[PDB]
Amino acid sequence: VPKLPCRVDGACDATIIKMMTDLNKKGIKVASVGQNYLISIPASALFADQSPRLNWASYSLLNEIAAFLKQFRKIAITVTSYSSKYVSVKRERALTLARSRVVSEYLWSQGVDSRIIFTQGLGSDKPITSYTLGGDRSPNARVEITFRRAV
């Protein structure tokens, strides 16, 4: 008992709430229901103009989001990408797939203890808003992460 850990290491509820508030006020979407958590990030703040080359400054954001992710004992994590219709379907589908692959690779390099990570990108096949005037600035063009807390 005395040497048994009091709580799960590297976890503080106050820290969790604080950083969740920070992300939400910075605009990155965090959504919670039951124990299933979803995070949304506009692709404009991440990539170039329809290019699968992450901007250098975004590494701080990636560090922050991984730091948040580290507090949850998890099993499976899904990362998917959405985009806008640009030239064809296959073009942006491949673009989304590459972007998801890159972000998944960076996360896997980071110390986020999971068992499974799925990654995919479906271009502009799941619209969420009628407004499609902008290109990479359109809100629907984004990335999203889903997972379910265990126990």
Q: Is 18 in the site for other proteins (CB under 8 A)?
A: yes
> Within 10-130, where are the H helices?
13-26, 58-69, 90-109
Residue span binding other proteins (CB under 8 A) among the ranges 11-19, 54-62, 86-94, 99-107: 11-19
C-alpha–C-alpha distance, residues 41 and 81, integer Å: 10
Query: With respect to other proteins, which residue has the nearer C-beta, 82 or 147?
Result: 147
Q: Judge whether 68 and 20 are in contact, CB under 8 Å.
A: yes
Q: Is 128 in the site for other proteins (CB under 8 A)?
A: no
C-alpha–C-alpha distance, residues 51 and 110, integer Å: 23
Q: Is 73 in the site for other proteins (CB under 8 A)?
A: yes
Q: Which two tokens stand for residue 84?
A: 């806008």
Q: Is 9 in the site for other proteins (CB under 8 A)?
A: yes
Give the interface with other proteins as residue ranges (CB under 8 A): 1, 3-9, 11-14, 17-18, 32, 35, 73, 149, 151
